[PDB]
């Protein structure tokens, strides 16, 4: 996250931290995710497509720090890694960028809700916030272009939803952004998601219910003028989510 604020998991308790174990036993951070039911985390297919082996991945809930333990945190393996069959990637744009991870503790159990672990509501069909709405994003991604390490503390920020009309302007993304995607950015281009934030939540207050409106997917650079963050429009994928869970 470029700019924004350091946060703690109690403020973002659906946030899932996804890592990958390597041969030799080193662990690296991959992407964020969102807990939508006790057994299911939702994320982005692009985070896993090149290494689609569920055994490689570790999922944490209730975790505020990248390489230290948080009290109340819970560690999971991936029982099922479901990638979207029509995923593809162009030069910038990623398509059907959505994935589901069925999680399981070593004891065979799903998540147990607590002060630091909670599910986030899915949106209803065809119902997204009006453009101009302020929404939040969360992740362990880069804070600046020059970072070669991710921040040790979880971050969040607030961005505004941008209309498809505006995001499809020539100096924005043109026809590369589709109606299955949502753009969001800072009007001053000072805060944004960045590499490492992918798969994380874009959450909007929708009829007073916090709702998983988007999933961090793509964008040209980070906090670049006229280059919004682009997000998987969760509301378009409800049949797919329903069928695969």
């Amino acid at each position: 996250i470029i700019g924004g604020e350091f946060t703690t998991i109690e403020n973002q308790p659906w946030f899932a931290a996804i890592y990958r174990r390597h041969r030799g036993g080193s662990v690296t951070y991959v992407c964020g995710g969102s807990l939508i039911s006790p057994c299911w985390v939702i994320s982005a297919t692009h985070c896993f497509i090149d290494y689609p082996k569920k055994e490689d991945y570790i999922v944490y809930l209730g975790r505020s720090r990248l390489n230290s333990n948080t009290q109340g945190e819970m560690k999971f393996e991936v029982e099922n890694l479901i990638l979207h069959k029509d995923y593809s990637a162009d030069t910038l744009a990623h398509h059907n960028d959505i994935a589901l991870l069925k999680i399981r503790s070593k004891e065979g159990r799903c998540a147990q809700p607590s002060r630091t672990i909670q599910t986030i509501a899915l949106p209803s069909m065809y119902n997204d916030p009006q453009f101009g709405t302020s929404c939040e994003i969360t992740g362990f991604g880069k804070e600046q272009s020059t970072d070669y390490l991710y921040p040790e503390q979880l971050k969040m920020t607030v961005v505004k939803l941008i209309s498809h009309r505006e995001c499809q302007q020539p100096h924005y993304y043109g026809s590369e952004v589709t109606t299955k995607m949502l753009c969001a950015a800072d009007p001053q281009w000072k805060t944004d998601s960045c590499q490492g934030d992918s798969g994380g939540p874009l959450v909007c207050s929708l009829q007073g219910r916090m709702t998983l409106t988007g999933i961090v997917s793509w964008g040209r650079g980070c906090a670049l003028k006229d280059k919004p963050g682009v997000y998987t429009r969760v509301s378009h994928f409800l049949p797919w989510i329903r069928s695969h869970t």
Binding site: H46, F48, D50, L92, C194, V216, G219, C222
Partner: peptide, 14 residues
């Protein structure tokens, strides 16, 4: 890997 932005996490680029 690729360090080119959102979309490139955990990729193989030899």
């Amino acid at each position: 890997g690729x360090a080119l932005g959102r979309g490139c996490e955990n990729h193989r680029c030899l």
